[PDB]
From a paper:
The cancerous inhibitor of protein phosphatase 2A (CIP2A) is an oncoprotein found overexpressed in many types of cancer. Here we report that phosphorylation of Ser904 creates a mode-III 14-3-3 binding site in the C-terminus of CIP2A.
For structural analysis of the interaction, a CIP2A peptide representing the C-terminal amino acid sequence was cocrystallized with 14-3-3σΔC. The space group was determined to be C2221 with one 14-3-3 monomer in the asymmetric unit. The 2F0-FC density map allowed us to build five amino acids of the peptide sequence. Analysis of the crystal structure reveals a typical mode-III binding motif. The binding of the peptide is primarily mediated by the polar contacts between Lys49, Arg56, Arg129, and Tyr130, consistent with most 14-3-3 binding partners. Additional polar contacts are mediated by Asn175, Glu182, and Asn226. Studying the C-terminal amino acid sequence of CIP2A reveals that it contains a putative mode-III 14-3-3 interaction motif (x-x-x-[pS/pT]-X1–2-COOH), in which phosphorylation of Ser904 is a prerequisite for 14-3-3 binding. Additionally, concentration–response curves generated with peptide 1 confirm that the interaction is phosphorylation-dependent, as the nonphosphorylated peptide does not interact with 14-3-3.
Numbering used by the authors:
A (entry chain A), C (entry chain A): -4 to 231
B (entry chain B), D (entry chain B): 901 to 905
Write the structure that this text describes.
């Protein structure tokens, strides 16, 4: 790997610099290098990893949606034939997106998840596994579509089971996991009622635990609770 | 769009 | 070149798709491929080329400034030593930026400028040559700094001479050339009085020609005139 | 910042 000659600490330092410079591809490459050193990741390091790839794949997903919409229009009644270019370029972006997802899933499988024993790390990584299979599912159209969806579901479900046993209802990792699993239900699994039930129960159980929290923890938790509420307002 | 985090 | 097997028209079509998807690195690679087909570029094609590389290099310049500011702070009195990482990563971004500038200047020299005979193409390309030497000048610190600056000046000056002979004072290419040459004077050449004089004379001569224009041309010209005015307000 | 185009 091109980062094999750089110190772990230097990779982390440069990931933080890249973030400040909004250079998220660089940030992701630095954090990939840090993971490949083979040591477990601290809480701060896990979040650098997730921030970096979330931004990279987020831009790819937005580009894919633009191109897929152009492509769908070209296949409407009365649309002039324009050749293979739209499909080719949508395919190019799609392939790069899948490559990023595969890279993340590879890091999780070699060997972040198997070494993660604390709830905060294990739930975090299993949420990531669910998220990146969900991104694969968004672009999937072939024979593997159902297996991709079930891989997302299975990872989210393992993370939910651990989070409910090991974390309080206001824990921000637990809350963000539930938010994204509810999006999975609504957007991927064709299960809007499950999505709505999960978001509401998650919100209500967190609300009832806020009284235990400091001011700073209260701010962290209510921020994600508001995202649950925003989705419920969109979906109902 | 759906909100995720 | 990786685009050597794609039709010129397909490269242009995909550049326009990449722009819609805000995929400016892709857009630039497609337009580089189109240039390397060896045919002259239409007005619309020249602007696709400039839009693409302007966005790529614009992001690199912004990242470089963030990192250069961190680096300068680390060299202040009382700053804790943090190792070579800040300098290394600033150097990495700087090198990639210079590579993009060299690529553009290479396209202009092989062979866009020598085939450009109409004022609208020749001034456009010479403005680009001035712009990308100016971006090299922004990061230059060595023995070649003065020659880089003079290369920017020389290209801008040739473009100005042609534009004043061959174009009306409201021509948007002429106006944008003058805007950027005034920025060169202010920011690169340590000549704020020259910058201010150029911007004011350019603005006033355009103002006096607006009466000749259609509504649509009037909108194109006044838009760039407002940028001259914004700079004058900042500089005076 | 300086305005350019
Ligand atoms: Cl393509
Ligand atoms: Cl570096
Ligand atoms: Mg070491
Ligand atoms: Mg462990
Ligand atoms: Mg051909
Ligand atoms: Mg010619």
């Amino acid at each position: 790997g091109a980062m094999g000659s750089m110190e772990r600490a230097s990779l982390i330092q440069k990931a933080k610099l890249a973030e400040q410079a909004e250079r998220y591809e660089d940030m992701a490459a630095f954090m990939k290098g840090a993971v490949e050193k083979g040591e477990e990741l601290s809480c701060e390091e896990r979040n650098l990893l997730s921030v970096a790839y979330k931004n990279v794949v987020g831009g790819q997903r937005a580009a894919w949606r633009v191109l897929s919409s152009i492509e769908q229009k070209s296949n409407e009644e009365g649309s002039e034939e324009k050749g293979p270019e739209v499909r080719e370029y949508r395919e190019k972006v799609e392939t790069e997106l899948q490559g990023v997802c595969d890279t993340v899933l590879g890091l999780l499988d070699s060997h972040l998840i198997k070494e993660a024993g604390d709830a905060e790390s294990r739930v975090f990584y299993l949420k990531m596994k669910g998220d990146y299979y969900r991104y694969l599912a968004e672009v999937a159209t072939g024979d593997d579509k159902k297996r991709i969806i079930d891989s997302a579901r299975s990872a989210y479900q393992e993370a939910m089971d651990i989070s409910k046993k090991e974390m309080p209802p206001t824990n921000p990792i637990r809350l963000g996991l539930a938010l994204n699993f509810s999006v999975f239900h609504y957007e991927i699994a064709n299960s809007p009622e499950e999505a709505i039930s999960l978001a509401k129960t998650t919100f209500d159980e967190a609300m009832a635990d806020l009284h235990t929290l400091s001011e700073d923890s209260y701010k962290d938790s209510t921020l994600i609770m508001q995202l649950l509420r925003d989705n419920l307002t969109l979906w109902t | 769009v759906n909100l995720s985090i």
